[PDB]
Design a protein around this ligand. Structure first.
Ligand SMILES: [Mn+2]
Length: 196
């Protein structure tokens, strides 16, 4: 006679095993979970698992999201869609996003994440930016500013006035508010990004 409590206990052990396998080798971890019917092999379901992140290494999460593979790309889109950026300013939203995983080192991986982020930010906050290219450019400006201001290996530091000068043109056929740019600058300047 089948004992469902036994089934649950075995499943818990397998899930614990799967998380541990994921932290070593994200694709292997996901394949194991999928094969044992512990996770559905759908972009949305895998994205929900990584967004919850229970006992998952955020560098592993990032590495999974940065694979240039059809499924992983679908997962990255779904994962960014689980974020809630409505009513946040760009730095506030970036802080939420960049807490949920550790960015890969590779520029192309970062780029795909940053494009996805910018498109989702603009959809959640229509009319803040006149295009997604503007928000993409400005999201990099903010990430680079965090690096420039808070990594001491970057010698000479960019001041507010220069940051505003670089970025005021990037909107459309007319500049943004310089209010919005000063707000982003000071935010980063006074609180670096919290990274995992
Ligand atoms: Mn501070």
């Amino acid at each position: 006679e089948a004992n469902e409590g036994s089934k649950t206990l075995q499943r818990n052990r397998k899930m614990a095993m799967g998380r541990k396998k994921f932290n070593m080798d994200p694709k292997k971890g996901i394949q194991f979970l999928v094969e044992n019917e512990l996770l559905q092999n759908t972009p949305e379901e895998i994205a929900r698992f990584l967004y919850k992140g229970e006992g998952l290494n955020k560098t592993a999460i990032g590495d999974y999201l940065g694979e240039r593979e059809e499924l992983n790309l679908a997962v990255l889109h779904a994962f960014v869609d689980l974020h809630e950026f409505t009513d946040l300013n760009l730095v506030q939203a970036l802080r939420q996003f960049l807490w949920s995983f550790r960015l890969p080192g590779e520029a192309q991986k970062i780029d795909r994440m940053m494009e996805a982020f910018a498109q989702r930010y603009c959809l959640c906050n229509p009319g803040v930016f006149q295009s997604t290219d503007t928000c993409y450019v400005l999201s990099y400006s903010v990430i680079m500013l965090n690096t420039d201001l808070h990594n001491p290996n970057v010698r000479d530091k960019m001041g507010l006035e220069r940051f505003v000068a670089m970025n005021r043109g990037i909107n459309e056929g007319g500049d943004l508010p310089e209010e919005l740019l000063r707000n982003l600058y000071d935010s980063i300047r006074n609180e670096p990004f919290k990274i995992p």
